[PDB]
Amino acid sequence: SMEQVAMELRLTELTRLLRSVLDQLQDKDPARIFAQPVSLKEVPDYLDHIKHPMDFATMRKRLEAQGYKNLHEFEEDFDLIIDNCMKYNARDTVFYRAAVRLRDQGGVVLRQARREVDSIG
Numbered sequence: 001s002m003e004q005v006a007m008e009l010r011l012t013e014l015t016r017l018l019r020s021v022l023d024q025l026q027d028k029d030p031a032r033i034f035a036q037p038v039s040l041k042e043v044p045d046y047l048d049h050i051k052h053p054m055d056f057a058t059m060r061k062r063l064e065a066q067g068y069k070n071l072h073e074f075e076e077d078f079d080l081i082i083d084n085c086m087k088y089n090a091r092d093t094v095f096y097r098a099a100v101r102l103r104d105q106g107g108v109v110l111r112q113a114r115r116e117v118d119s120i121g
Contacts, residue, residue: 010121015066017120018074021113022063025078026056028105033098034081049088054080071117075110082106 029035037055038046046053059077068074085099 011066011069013120014068014070014117015063017113017116018063018068018071021074021109022056022059024109025102025106028102028109029056029098031098033095034085034102046088050084052080053084054078056081071114078106078110 026035035056037058038050038053040046054077059074059081062068062077063074082099082103085095089095089099
């Protein structure tokens with residue numbers, strides 16, 4: 001049906017936007033602290049601490065399978081990256097302080113993206 005095709009054109013354009021948003025967010029992490037999942041081999045207790053791990057690569061996998069239906073969903077995953085990091089790591093560590101910086105810098109990008117999604121439907 002043509003109704004189905006139209007929803008699919010909208011999902012694809014959402015996805016195109018979200019890829020730009022993801023690359024913008026990932027540029028605020030030049031150190032690449034958040035690029036890949038936490039290694040269970042290198043932090044073996046991690047899953048006792050954090051119930052929903054998240055990282056940029058896992059977001060990108062989901063993005064390329066058009067698995068984000070709206071921006072709320074993508075925002076939820078981004079926030080997990082930040083929030084997991086601020087719980088596991090103490091306040092005086094390089095990791096916590098990188099999350100805080102990514103939150104503040106990403107918060108700008110996501111403030112405009114919310115306007116572009118409303119504005120472009």
